[PDB]
A paper describes a structure:
[name] (soluble N-ethylmaleimide-sensitive factor ([name]) attachment protein receptor) proteins drive membrane fusion at different cell compartments as their core domains zipper into a parallel four-helix bundle. After fusion, these bundles are disassembled by the AAA+ (ATPase associated with diverse cellular activities) protein [name]/[name] and its adaptor [name]/α-SNAP to make them available for subsequent rounds of membrane fusion. The disassembly requires multiple ATP hydrolysis events in the presence of Mg2+; as few as six ATP hydrolysis events are sufficient. The side-loading and side-release mechanism explains how [name]/[name] can disassemble SNAREs with constrained topologies.
We chose the [name]–[name]–[name]/Snc2 complex (referred to as the ySNARE complex) because each component of this complex crosslinked with high confidence to the D2 domain of [name] ([name] is highly homologous to Snc2). We prepared the [name] complex in a nonhydrolyzing condition and, after single-particle cryo-EM data collection and processing, we obtained 381,591 high-quality particles that yielded eight three-dimensional (3D) classes into which models were built. In the structures of all eight classes, [name] is threaded through the D1 pore of [name]. A characteristic phenylalanine side-chain density in [name] is present at the same position relative to [name] in all classes, allowing for reliable indexing of [name]. The nucleotide states and the arrangements of D1 around the substrate were also the same among all eight classes, with the ADP-engaged E protomer forming the top of a spiral staircase of tyrosine residues. Protomers D, B and C were all ATP bound and formed the middle of the staircase. The bottom protomer, A, formed the base of the staircase. Protomer F, with no apparent density for nucleotide in D1, was not associated with [name]. Given that this charge distribution is replicated between each pair of D2 subdomains around the D2 surface, it is unsurprising that the Habc domain adopts multiple corresponding rotational states over the eight classes, presumably because of the flexible linker that follows it.
Numbering used by the authors:
A (entry chain H): 1 to 48, 53 to 292
B (entry chain G), C (entry chain I): 1 to 292
D (entry chain L): 433 to 499, 589 to 650
E (entry chain J): 27 to 86
F (entry chain K): 213 to 257
Amino acid sequence: MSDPVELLKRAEKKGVPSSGFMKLFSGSDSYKFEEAADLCVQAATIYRLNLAGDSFLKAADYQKKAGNEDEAGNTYVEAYKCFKSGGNSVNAVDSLENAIQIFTHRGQFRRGANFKFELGEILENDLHDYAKAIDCYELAGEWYAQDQSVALSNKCFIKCADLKALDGQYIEASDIYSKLIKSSMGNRLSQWSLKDYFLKKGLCQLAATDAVAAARTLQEGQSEDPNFADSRESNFLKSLIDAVNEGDSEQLSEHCKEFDNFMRLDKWKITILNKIKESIQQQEDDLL
Amino acid sequence: MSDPVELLKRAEKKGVPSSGFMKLFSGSDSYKFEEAADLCVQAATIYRLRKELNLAGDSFLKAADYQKKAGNEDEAGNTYVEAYKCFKSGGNSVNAVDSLENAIQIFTHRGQFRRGANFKFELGEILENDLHDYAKAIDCYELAGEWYAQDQSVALSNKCFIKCADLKALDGQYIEASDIYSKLIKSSMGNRLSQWSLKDYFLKKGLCQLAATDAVAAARTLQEGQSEDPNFADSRESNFLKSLIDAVNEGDSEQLSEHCKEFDNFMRLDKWKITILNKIKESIQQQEDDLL
Amino acid sequence: MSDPVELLKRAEKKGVPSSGFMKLFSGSDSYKFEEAADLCVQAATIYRLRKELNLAGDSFLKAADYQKKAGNEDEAGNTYVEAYKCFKSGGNSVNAVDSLENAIQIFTHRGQFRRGANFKFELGEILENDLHDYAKAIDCYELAGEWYAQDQSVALSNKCFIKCADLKALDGQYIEASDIYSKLIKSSMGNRLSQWSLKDYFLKKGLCQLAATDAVAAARTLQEGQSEDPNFADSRESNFLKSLIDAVNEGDSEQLSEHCKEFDNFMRLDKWKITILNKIKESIQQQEDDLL
Amino acid sequence: IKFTKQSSVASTRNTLKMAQDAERAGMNTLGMLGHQSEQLNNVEGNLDLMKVQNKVADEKVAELKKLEMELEIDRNLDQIQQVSNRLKKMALTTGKELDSQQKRLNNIEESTDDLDINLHMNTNRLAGI
Amino acid sequence: SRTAELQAEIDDTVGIMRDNINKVAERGERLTSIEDKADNLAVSAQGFKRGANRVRKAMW
Amino acid sequence: LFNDMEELVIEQQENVDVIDKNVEDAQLDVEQGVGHTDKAVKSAR
């Protein structure tokens, strides 16, 4: 079985550009980079995970030097596979950046959005670097929206608007809860999600202490979507608005427990509700 | 139709490498091995038409060996898979295992991990069900699950890790099974699609932790599941795990049996759960006996 | 990569037919058109890579036109299909319609009726959903269903005729919608696979006959279905159609609304059926108002 | 008396909840089966094209070689009954669509195998030229 | 009588869904086999391409 | 049952993706291969 170290050494030797006088006699350096990339891909296949990933990165760099950006993007995706699976999230991120850049330059925005969402997942879950995860979900959603893929765009914007609300960017999250609402009106497949969106929008507007906007969102949802009108989510949002207007945190706690009994509050709703509670209590203390 | 025995004899005759002085005048021996492999494949096809499946498998093994000698490893992997199919359909599980092992070694070597993971999972199935070699089945499923995780095939990786964890827990490796269930749980969080498997995973994790007499870890697993997955919070599985933990902490084997019957009436306990629950009961009863 | 604008310019220059004295010395103009078509296809492939898809479609249209001038109509149809794909992916439904139409005439002229039927159905979908040209979509589905019926593909023909009958009934065109449902019923008799669809067809037929204020034809449809298909006899669709007929004969719109709600509770009434049942209701109410 | 009515209300609440969950899963599965049906259509088209190309390849290779509790229970049963309907038609339509896909997949398998065999034959013939 | 009717419908739907589960298994097996054979097809197509190219160069 | 069905269909999506990709790739190589045999014949004549 060939030794991958020797293959990488041969790839390195072949990957030296012709400099000076021999450049007048040597053909295009593209072929040398192609052969070095092939050697690097072989080494990567034998290693196959971190050493396989590093070997695919070298291959992709040589493919870029050859003018074969195409294979370079594919090879960066392979490097990302190797890195993600080796627990090396940083190199996975780097590989996805290079692959996405190659794709977007080439006019594969769909593939770019796919890997942009994958990148956002790596940023959110493995690196906990939420800001760039928000950025990636937003940009992937935009690229899907250009492609007229409403479902994928909505998935990205659900993630993006949700990371924004947990980061305290409640107004911007509400603006993305609003886009999701318009993109989902009239679509029978999204009816269950639509109620959810209305609720979350109001919650952000309650965490931004704009109870008037929450009331308006409630009225809008009640008027535009009959399924939301009679839903437990609409009643819950109304009760939360009434409690916020009354400055009664204990009542809002009762409402949260009641709603929890019938439809479990997931971590996000608990989190946002806790800030709504804190705002009411802070107003009470300031009035004392 | 040609006689397959005659074809195999000619394959054997052609498959002799050039030795001595003849090697200076004979071209690459690859072509001789290719032709012998073709003859062996013909014999294998003839046997397969006659439903002499084991003989067809053996002929395919010979063909694959000649293909390996020719330098055509990809064709050798294809032919080993064919030999595996012939043996499996013939009830010769041992030769099926051998064929899949050679095929998997080749399919690995050519960077073909997803494929080798499919065949490694199939090998694990043959080991578990036909040969009852549970240890190698565990290894096969772990190996296949890791390779699927390498392809970002979360679903296939989860299937392999479910099999691995189940077999480990049945083998008395409760802690390692609990760790694999932790991996399954983490890989399934937030995916709407696996919600129903997710509840099951939490339950099983606690059960292994109860079979290892670590009730505290079972309680922590219950709390984690109740906090992280709302669908698990209200589930019958969470209440059942809580009740089992309470029974274990109380050292009351009869209450554990009552809870098992109650859970059985609403949600049938499959064989695995019955075995693990019996182990937990046995541990409680052993502690009771040790205190008298 | 070549500049596709330059490729199209070279295609345009090559695509000029030999006029005058030069025609006596120039070979067949077919080769020039072939080369221009190849250039246009290269420009189209470059444009498609760049996802400014409408221009890729335009380049494919130019390529197909040159291919038609070359006498190579089959490649012209293939290229029109490619142009259609580019336009549809680009949100330019009008040019997609034009491309599919040209491809369909090419295919039908060559006796490839099945392929033309496929693209005629797709064209009808583009008309129904993107352009809201329901009349010519009805025409498309009818003709595609006929072409499938000639090819003895009962299933595809039924799909097209279902779409045609639905659109006809929604347009106010009830009687011939019921006729198409009669054809669907006749083509679905005796086929176990279509058993679930058959009940649906009977119901819809009666509904159109109720929207045409022909309660007698609806009743005859009911007895026909009851006698010819035992599964429709005992079904909820048959009882619902009977109840609607009874309400229509009694001139009691509120009874019809109660039956619609009752059937809604056991059978959610899709958008099409809601429209038709509403129409039946206004017909009853109009008769009531005319009697006061 | 009251305790049983409360327990029954709770029963019908969970009953409706589970029914709705089932329906969500069914709708995703039908839409997802439709998407996979479209993909398989693309596969089918490509296989048809390859058949034609392999005819061409065969001829070229040949020539190449030649060269309040009661009311709530009632209403919950109403909503349950609605959803259970949706579950029944969804199951039936799923069986239908999937049966058609099973026959289609069988044909796809056979065509793929035949194309693979033809390509191997022509590659072997080209090797000797 | 309403609720029994409901129970009867749910029981029928469970039967249809058990049937469906059996069918989707048949489908998963078939799809695994088709993936393996489509991989074979792709490899063979590439091999046919390369062999045809080599014959093209030999003849040139 | 509905939950299990959804999960199985989600899993099977992986297979369908790969099949579509491989068959598409195969078709393009076959087309190229035929192109080569055409040119080979043109020369051999």
